[PDB]
Amino acid sequence: VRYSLDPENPTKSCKSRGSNLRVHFKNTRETAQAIKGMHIRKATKYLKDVTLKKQCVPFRRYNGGVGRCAQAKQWGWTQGRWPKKSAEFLLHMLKNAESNAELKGLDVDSLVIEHIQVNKAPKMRRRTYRAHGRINPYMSSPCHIEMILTEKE
């Protein structure tokens, strides 16, 4: 199918996708824009820091009701949380992309993520009960993810 960003070179670059993941759209977009421009080893170290709760993700656009923290002073922002589930799914996605680079016959340490995008998805339908007999929704917000790796020395 037609993608959003065509690759500059099919030999060096590669793509991978993840469809229908039960993760939040805002948190997934924010961690994608945070991990978009780093090296793969620094990205794995950052995911280890998220797992050990050492380095959080700052929220600059969707900034509401989030407490301040000192560990986000490296990026230059007050708020910060740890999207652990989205981090585990993107860790599986980077593992699948590294396997795709291995199937293509690519180098390991020279891979740099260049582009990643979080697109919308059809939502589920469930509800909960409240007072006076009024049905109110309990809907989710799934998303589709695509990412591009490129060897840059």
Residues lying near RNA in the complex (CB under 7 A) are found at 1-2, 14-20, 22-27, 53, 60, 62-69, 78-86, 92, 95-97, 99-100, 102-104, 120, 123-124, 129-134, 136-141
**What is the nearest approach in angstroms of RNA to the Cβ of residue 77?**
8
CA distance 27 to 57: 9
Q: Between 25-35 and 84-104, two packed helices, what is the crossing angle to 10 degrees?
A: 50
CA distance 55 to 114: 22
Count of other CB atoms within 10 angstroms of residue 14: 20
Q: Which residues contact 98 (CB under 8 A, 6 or more apart)?
A: 40, 108, 111
State which residue, 135 or 153, has the beta carbon closest to RNA. Answer: 135
**What is the nearest approach in angstroms of RNA to the Cβ of residue 68?**
7
The distance in angstroms from the start CA to the end CA of the chain is 30
State which residue, 125 or 153, has the beta carbon closest to RNA. Answer: 125
**What is the nearest approach in angstroms of RNA to the Cβ of residue 72?**
10
State which residue, 37 or 99, has the beta carbon closest to RNA. Answer: 99
State which residue, 100 or 150, has the beta carbon closest to RNA. Answer: 100
**What is the nearest approach in angstroms of RNA to the Cβ of residue 8?**
14
